[PDB]
């Protein structure tokens, strides 16, 4: 099957450059353009440009004049994209694709995609989070269902992983989108169950936090 | 550079339905444009090229239309799978041009909020912080309103807010919201109140604690 797999999340300080990979199978790699494309939270698509391997063609967007270059090993079936003097704005996911083959047409559409690698530039410093449990209040608890919670506050950069009784709790999960203030992230996530699961069995969060090298599992307890 | 516009963020439709997605371009584009499909967290995929070709795979379905600036994504028949961000993309100058996509939602039965509160953990506390937080789960439709009361008099500064996009298995909505005191302030108060506003009443949800309780 035809896939395009990316390298992984990349963390950089201001003024550092990074080198993205783009491992293309299974196909003719020097018979299709590689594109790459830059999402920044809240904003559309970018296109950064596109490099021909084998044959070394490349085009860029002109606002990406000094920032992106690219390089395509043939060896390897690989693409791969530099960016140089990393600023805040340049935090972003980034997307490598094939551009479909075309004829006179010149429909110049993708139809593969990677999965994208995220990059963050920042000064900030890594904090590695708290994590907090959410057990319902001392008093009663009538319904068939009780919902637990864990709080994951004050960490930095994204992302984090959260996960119930190591993934095995997956129904009745929600993880809530994180939120920034300073320069740091505060993340939460609801668990419910059924009155008769807990507190007769335990319920765990298990949160990962690569960029400071961290993971915690907090068991939710009773309160009393 | 050649601006895609697609005015419309998100959009409705029950199952069955017919929806359509717009996408404008600041300049002629002849028939060079193509659609995507991007589900939650997973990788676009390729929908229509030269405005109205289906690409090989893609149900009938969807359809394309338009040509020179006006351009329309078309959906019959709407299924659970097609919950997903749907965007343009321009190729007949480079560089080429993306729109920022628009999200389909999918209708479904009013549903009021299951509301749960939950006060500071002791270990934050250790820290001095002190944080409350509120879930408002599984509500339809997205809009929903929270307040916060201390010992009964509402409660603005220190709330953030988080929401979840329209679950893929039930299509509702969730919401949570935190409210962070410092101990020495939260000390200093007994009843804490989460109240959940929302269209299917006009009786506000109430979930509330006290300090004192155990």
């Known amino acids: 099957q035809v896939q395009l797999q990316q390298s992984g999340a990349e963390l950089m300080k201001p003024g550092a450059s990074v080198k993205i990979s783009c491992k293309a199978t299974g196909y003719t790699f020097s018979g299709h353009w590689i594109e790459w494309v830059k999402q920044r939270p809240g904003h559309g698509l970018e296109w950064i440009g596109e490099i021909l391997p084998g044959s070394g063609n490349i085009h860029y967007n002109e606002k990406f004049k000094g920032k992106a270059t690219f390089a395509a090993d043939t060896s390897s079936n690989t693409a791969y994209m530099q960016l140089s003097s990393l600023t805040s704005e340049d935090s972003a996911v980034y997307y490598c694709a094939r551009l479909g083959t075309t004829a006179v047409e010149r429909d110049w559409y993708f139809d593969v995609w990677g999965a994208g690698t995220t990059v963050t530039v920042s000064l900030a410093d890594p904090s590695a989070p708290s994590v907090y449990p959410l057990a319902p209040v001392c008093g009663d608890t009538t319904g068939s269902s009780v919902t637990l919670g864990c709080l994951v506050k004050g960490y930095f950069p994204e992302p984090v992983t959260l996960t119930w009784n190591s993934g095995s709790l997956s129904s009745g999960v929600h993880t809530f989108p994180a939120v920034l203030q300073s320069d740091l992230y505060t993340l939460s996530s609801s668990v419910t169950v059924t009155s008769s699961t807990w507190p007769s069995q335990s319920i765990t969060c298990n949160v990962a936090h690569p960029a400071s090298s961290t993971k915690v599992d907090k068991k939710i307890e009773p309160r009393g | 550079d050649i601006v895609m516009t697609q005015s419309q963020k998100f959009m409705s439709a029950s199952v069955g339905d017919r929806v359509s997605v717009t996408c404008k371009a600041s300049?002629?584009?002849?028939?060079?444009l193509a659609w995507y499909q991007q589900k939650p967290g997973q990788s676009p995929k390729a929908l229509i090229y030269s405005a109205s070709y289906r690409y090989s795979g893609v149900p009938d379905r969807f359809t394309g239309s338009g040509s020179g600036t006006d351009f329309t994504l078309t959906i019959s028949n709407v299924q659970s799978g097609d919950l997903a961000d749907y965007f343009c993309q321009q190729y007949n100058n480079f560089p080429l041009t993306f729109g920022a996509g628009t999200k389909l939602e999918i209708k479904r039965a009013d549903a009021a909020p299951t509301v749960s509160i939950f006060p500071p953990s002791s270990e934050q506390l250790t820290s001095g912080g002190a944080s409350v937080v509120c879930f408002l789960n599984n509500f339809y439709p997205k809009d929903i309103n929270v307040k916060w009361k201390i010992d009964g008099s509402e409660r603005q500064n220190g709330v953030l807010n988080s929401w979840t996009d329209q679950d893929s298995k039930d299509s509702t909505y969730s919401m949570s919201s935190t409210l962070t005191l410092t101990r020495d302030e939260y000390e200093r108060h007994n009843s804490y109140t989460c109240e959940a506003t929302h269209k299917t009443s006009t009786s506000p949800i109430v979930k509330s604690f006290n300090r004192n309780e155990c």
């Open positions: 300049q002629n584009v002849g028939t060079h």
